[PDB]
């Protein structure tokens, strides 16, 4: 051949049990809003009801984990204390 | 000459009252002379020039500054009358420097001039004012005044620190590097809107760590230490996050080298360098697209995915193209090219069959839009006499039916020639600026809510505007208070009983969870 690849340096991202398509706290969907929002709108204050991303790389509706921090505080899918780093998606 | 002659008058009056007159009357003499002469002429000098304060500041005769400092120290309110004029001059120089006219200016030269003017101001302060507190606070407020302007001042500061951290070509030794870094963080001290600063600093970290390594390998510790000592442990945590990701993915690279020596099935894993990062620290570039993969990289990615699903179960990987690089071994000698995960698919399609066009690479490739056109231009448009992908219809704009060819270009005096069309002159186009502004706005809107729900659970309640003052004071060193935004956002959480904060029942807030 005329051009042959010798080296490569991809960077491979990874996702834990985020289950893209369901939230582990309320079980609704990665979208479709949450249990504390019901319909997509239903007074969602300009769609502020967004997804929250932990350091453990799990994902839930911001609302569903926020309310889980008024009772527990250690991420239900492992044991890590859980942080609030990345947001949205 | 006025300062010298008035000093001579002061000295001669001192000895006159000490010998001819009674030395006990020294007080009222100082009174009359000092009071009248200096106070009346304070106005006349704040008003003049011709080798005056605003002229000696730009000329740089430090002896005059020291003389007037030691003279005006006796007259009351004189230090204020000179602080106001020097602050006016500094604000003029600032708004002349931070001017947005003349698009295309070099940002590193801009911040270099800013550092130069602040350094000459600080040296004139230390030599004349002897590290005075009033002058220091006035220049501090002056720096806080006009540095807030521009939606790009922290962005330009981040670009400057990136240019200074990528390679220490200028100032090979460590002393001047240390001094320039201290001056940089001092300049950053008198700057607001730290959120965009941290965002662009993290973006520059991602740009400098996901590229060719061995930039400094030691200055990262100094950078994180200065960040800890300057802003505090709040974003430096995410910084440690990123660096840890890096070193851990280096250990993962050695681990995968072992696991690849474990099978060696197909000729696709000749030389592999795969990096494993987390989304919690590294955000998506544009869309994380799903373009095709060349066959040997296909086999390499398949082997890596099988390994990561067999011995690292509990998580699945996602494929993308907007990150990384490669070394394309071309072949009178064998010169190895370089492709940054963008030209691999097009060059592979050319290897499979030459004489293609835009339709061929847009039909049988499942190619996105923006990055596709970007890479097309990077390879055939705006190229110096090192063209690796030529075409017959020579034109600036991109057509559809244009055949692509290849040229030798023996000007490469080595075997490792790279096409670094990416990371060009800092343009900061409107779409990327708007999207990062929206991102940082959402970040602020989430951080204010996090802060309010972390704080007001252990504090008292507000009636109309009591706790908003506290939530703005806690964020004073972060960014602007944005009264309208916070007022619109605090009334959105009322949807449920949790911290109702009802505008009707503002008498007692629910101290529950
Ligand atoms: Zn949920
Ligand atoms: Zn919700
Ligand atoms: Zn978790």
From Swiss-Prot, chain A:
Zn(2+) 1 binds at residues 23, 26, 61, 64. Zn(2+) 3 binds at residues 56, 58, 75, 78. Its main location: cytoplasm. Keywords: Acetylation, Cytoplasm, DNA damage, DNA repair, Host-virus interaction, Metal-binding, Nucleus, Phosphoprotein, Transferase, Ubl conjugation pathway, Zinc, Zinc-finger. Zn(2+) 2 binds at residues 34, 37, 49, 63. Component of multiple Cul1-RING E3 ubiquitin-protein ligase complexes commonly known as SCF (SKP1-CUL1-F-box) complexes, consisting of CUL1, SKP1, RBX1 and a variable F-box domain-containing protein. Part of a SCF(SKP2) complex consisting of CUL1, RBX1, SKP1 and SKP2. Part of a SCF(FBXO3) complex consisting of CUL1, FBXO3, RBX1 and SKP1; this complex interacts with PML via FBXO3. Component of the SCF(Cyclin F) complex consisting of CUL1, RBX1, SKP1 and CCNF. Identified in a SCF E3 ubiquitin ligase complex together with HINT1 and CDC34. (Microbial infection) Interacts with human adenovirus 5 protein E1A; this interaction inhibits RBX1-CUL1-dependent elongation reaction of ubiquitin chains by the SCF(FBW7) complex. The RING-type zinc finger domain is essential for ubiquitin ligase activity. It coordinates an additional third zinc ion. This is E3 ubiquitin-protein ligase RBX1.
Curated annotation (Swiss-Prot), chain B:
It is found in: Nucleus; Golgi apparatus; Cell projection, Cilium, Flagellum; Cytoplasm, Cytoskeleton, Spindle. There is a cross-link at residue 457 (Glycyl lysine isopeptide (Lys-Gly) (interchain with G-Cter in NEDD8)). The keyword Transcription does not apply. Residues 422-443 are annotated as: Disordered. Transmembrane segments: none annotated. Keywords: Acetylation, Autism spectrum disorder, Cell cycle, Cell division, Cell projection, Cilium, Cilium biogenesis/degradation, Cytoplasm, Cytoskeleton, Disease variant, Epilepsy, ER-Golgi transport, Flagellum, Golgi apparatus, Intellectual disability, Isopeptide bond, Mitosis, Nucleus, Phosphoprotein, Transport, Ubl conjugation, Ubl conjugation pathway. GO terms for biological process: anaphase-promoting complex-dependent catabolic process; cell migration; cell projection organization; cellular response to amino acid stimulus; cellular response to oxidative stress; COPII vesicle coating; embryonic cleavage; endoplasmic reticulum to Golgi vesicle-mediated transport. Residues 443-505 form the Cullin neddylation domain. Disulfide bonds: none annotated. Pathway: Protein modification; protein ubiquitination. GO terms for cellular component: centrosome; Cul3-RING ubiquitin ligase complex; cytoplasm; cytosol; extracellular exosome; glutamatergic synapse; Golgi apparatus; membrane. Its main location: nucleus. Brain, spermatozoa, and testis (at protein level). Widely expressed. It comes from the Eukaryota. Neddylated. Attachment of NEDD8 is required for the E3 ubiquitin-protein ligase activity of the BCR complex. Deneddylated via its interaction with the COP9 signalosome (CSN) complex. The keyword Ion transport does not apply. GO terms for molecular function: cyclin binding; identical protein binding; Notch binding; POZ domain binding; ubiquitin ligase complex scaffold activity; ubiquitin protein ligase activity; ubiquitin protein ligase binding. Forms neddylation-dependent homodimers. Component of multiple BCR (BTB-CUL3-RBX1) E3 ubiquitin-protein ligase complexes formed of CUL3, RBX1 and a variable BTB domain-containing protein acting as both, adapter to cullin and substrate recognition subunit. The BCR complex may be active as a heterodimeric complex, in which NEDD8, covalently attached to one CUL3 molecule, binds to the C-terminus of a second CUL3 molecule. Interacts with RBX1, RNF7, CYCE and TIP120A/CAND1. Part of the BCR(SPOP) containing SPOP, and of BCR containing homodimeric SPOPL or the heterodimer formed by SPOP and SPOPL. It is linked to Pseudohypoaldosteronism 2E: An autosomal dominant disorder characterized by severe hypertension, hyperkalemia, hyperchloremia, hyperchloremic metabolic acidosis, and correction of physiologic abnormalities by thiazide diuretics. High-glucose conditions in renal tubular epithelial cells lead to up-regulation of CUL3 expression, significant increase in CUL3-mediated ubiquitination of MRPL12 and dysregulation of mitochondrial biosynthesis. This is Cullin-3. It comes from Homo sapiens. The lineage of its organism: Eukaryota, Metazoa, Chordata, Craniata, Vertebrata.
């Amino acid at each position: 051949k005329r051009f042959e690849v010798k080296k490569w340096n991809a960077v491979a991202l990874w996702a834990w049990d985020i289950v893209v398509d369901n939230c582990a706290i309320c079980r609704n969907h990665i979208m479709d809003l949450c249990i504390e929002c019901q319909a997509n709108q239903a007074s969602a204050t300009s769609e502020e009801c967004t997804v929250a991303w932990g350091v453990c790389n799990h994902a839930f509706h911001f609302h569903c984990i926020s309310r889980w921090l008024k009772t527990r505080q250690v991420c239900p899918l492992d044991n890590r204390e859980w942080e609030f780093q990345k947001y949205g998606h | 000459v006025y300062i010298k002659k008035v000093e001579a008058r002061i000295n001669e009056e001192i000895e006159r009252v000490m010998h001819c007159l009674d030395k006990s009357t020294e007080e009222p003499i100082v009174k009359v002379v000092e009071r009248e002469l200096i106070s009346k002429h304070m106005k006349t000098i704040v008003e003049m020039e011709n080798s005056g304060l605003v002229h000696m500041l730009k000329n740089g005769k430090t002896e005059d500054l020291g003389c007037m400092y030691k003279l005006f120290s006796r007259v009351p309110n004189g230090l204020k009358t000179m602080c106001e004029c020097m602050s006016s001059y500094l604000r003029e120089q600032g708004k002349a420097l931070v001017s947005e006219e003349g698009e295309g200016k070099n940002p590193v030269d801009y911040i270099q001039g800013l550092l130069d003017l602040k350094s000459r101001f600080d040296r004139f302060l230390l030599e004349s004012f002897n590290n005075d507190r009033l002058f220091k606070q006035t220049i501090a407020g002056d720096f806080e005044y006009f540095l807030n302007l521009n939606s790009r001042s922290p962005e330009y500061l981040s670009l400057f620190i990136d240019d200074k951290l990528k390679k220490g070509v200028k100032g090979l030794t460590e002393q001047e590097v240390e001094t320039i870094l201290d001056k940089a963080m001092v300049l950053f001290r008198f700057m607001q809107e730290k959120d965009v600063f941290e965002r662009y600093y993290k973006q520059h970290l991602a740009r400098r760590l996901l590229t060719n390594k061995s930039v400094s390998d030691d200055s990262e510790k100094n950078m994180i230490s200065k960040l800890k000592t300057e802003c505090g442990c709040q974003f430096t945590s995410k910084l440690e996050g990123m660096f840890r990701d890096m070193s851990i993915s280096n250990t993962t690279m050695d681990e995968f080298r072992q696991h690849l020596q474990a099978t060696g099935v197909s000729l696709g894993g000749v030389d592999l360098t795969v990096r494993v990062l987390t989304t919690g620290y590294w955000p998506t570039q544009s869309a994380t697209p799903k373009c095709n993969i060349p066959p040997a990289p296909r086999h390499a990615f398949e082997i890596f995915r099988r390994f990561y699903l067999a011995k690292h179960s509990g998580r699945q990987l996602t494929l993308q193209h907007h990150m990384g690089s490669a070394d394309l071994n071309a072949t009178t000698r064998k010169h190895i090219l370089q492709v940054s995960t963008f030209q691999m698919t097009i060059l592979m399609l050319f290897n499979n069959r030459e004489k293609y066009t835009f339709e061929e690479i847009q039909q049988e490739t499942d190619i996105p839009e923006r990055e596709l056109v970007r890479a097309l231009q990077s390879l055939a448009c705006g190229k110096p006499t090192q063209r690796v992908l030529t075409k017959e219809p020579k034109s600036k704009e991109i057509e559809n039916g244009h055949i692509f060819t290849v040229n030798d270009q023996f000007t490469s005096k080595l075997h490792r020639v790279k096409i670094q069309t990416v990371a060009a002159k800092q343009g900061e186009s409107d779409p990327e600026r708007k999207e990062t502004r929206q991102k940082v706005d959402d970040d602020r809107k989430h951080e204010i809510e996090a802060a309010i729900v972390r704080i007001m659970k252990s504090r008292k309640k507000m009636q109309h505007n009591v706790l908003v003052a506290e939530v703005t004071q806690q964020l004073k060193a972060r960014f602007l208070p944005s009264p309208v935004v916070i007022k619109k956002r605090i009334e959105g959480l009322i949807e449920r009983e949790y911290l109702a904060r009802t505008p009707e029942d503002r008498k007692v807030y629910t101290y529950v969870a």
